[PDB]
Design brief:
Length: about 220
DNA sequence: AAAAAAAAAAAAAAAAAAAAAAAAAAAAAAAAAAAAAAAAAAAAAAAAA
């Protein structure tokens, strides 16, 4: 997991078409969706964090929100990102995940050991947190994601533990529209069942809009 | 009268069994507490004219 030949990387860097090769090289098992692929590649590379003085933090993380009507490979995109990214962890708005968004402290079920079970937002501090079914979160999960995605920290006050612990993750989320079908007559905000503060903390909003197109349908079916 | 004897007869030392005294003496199991987590019942706050 350590690189010895920077030389090949740099040779590819001079290819002058490395960008389109990179974009075409993500989620190879998903047909189409090139704009989502550009956005996911950008997020996967990320920007530059910066903090003038020590008082004006600006993240370099590119958070991406895929909102699209069902059966449009959103979860497959998140699984691809989990495969490629180092320090990627996967979580869901339902209860069907090993890690949960919110930190808690408890005795571990298999260890029997009193453990600060830091959430999925801080387990991905230097990496990416993948939240599937983003619109189906708790109120607790929602305030957790809001704190991590605004402050890039998680504040515990549970047992005797008063700590703040860092969650500098890129959040990539997939959500479904309200009613299970994206309505382009409405704005994105009134389609998704997420509050404005949550949506504003995303750089890229990919509307994965599903339409009947015989050529695209045929290519996808062949795939 | 003293001169050999020839015993008591005392001492030191030994034995010599008794019968009493002296000297040795952690690790294994249990329970209780305090803490957890879990099935059930119970008590809250969002729904609409
Ligand atoms: N463009 C595509 N290319 C390749 N496979 C696709 C594409 N679109 C859908 N699929 C396939 O359709 C199936 C459904 O995908 P997926 O579960 O990712 O959809 P989803 O957006 O998560 O749906 P939901 O919103 O219901 O969770 C997947 O197995 C995926 O392989
Ligand atoms: Mg899905």
């Amino acid at each position: 997991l350590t690189d010895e030949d920077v030389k090949m990387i740099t040779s590819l860097s001079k290819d002058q078409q490395i960008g389109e090769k990179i974009f075409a090289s993500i989620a190879p098992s998903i047909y189409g969706h090139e704009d989502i692929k550009r956005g996911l590649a950008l997020a996967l590379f990320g920007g530059e964090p910066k903090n003038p003085g020590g008082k004006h933090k600006v993240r370099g993380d590119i958070n991406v929100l895929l909102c699209g009507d069902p059966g449009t490979a959103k979860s497959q995109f998140l699984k691809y990102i989990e495969k490629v990214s180092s320090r990627a962890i996967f979580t869901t708005g339902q209860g069907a995940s090993a890690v949960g968004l919110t930190a808690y402290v408890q005795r571990h079920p298999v260890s029997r050991e009193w453990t600060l079970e830091a959430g999925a937002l801080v387990l991905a501090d230097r990496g990416v947190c993948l939240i599937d079914e983003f619109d189906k979160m708790n109120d607790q999960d929602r305030t957790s994601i809001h704190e991590a995605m605004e402050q890039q920290s998680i504040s515990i006050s549970k047992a005797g533990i008063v700590t703040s612990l860092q969650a500098r993750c890129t959040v990539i989320a997939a959500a479904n529209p309200i009613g299970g079908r994206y309505d382009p007559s409405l704005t994105f905000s009134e389609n998704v069942d997420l509050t404005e503060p949550i949506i504003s903390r995303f750089d890229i909003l990919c509307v994965v809009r599903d339409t009947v197109d015989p050529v695209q349908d045929e290519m996808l079916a062949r795939f």
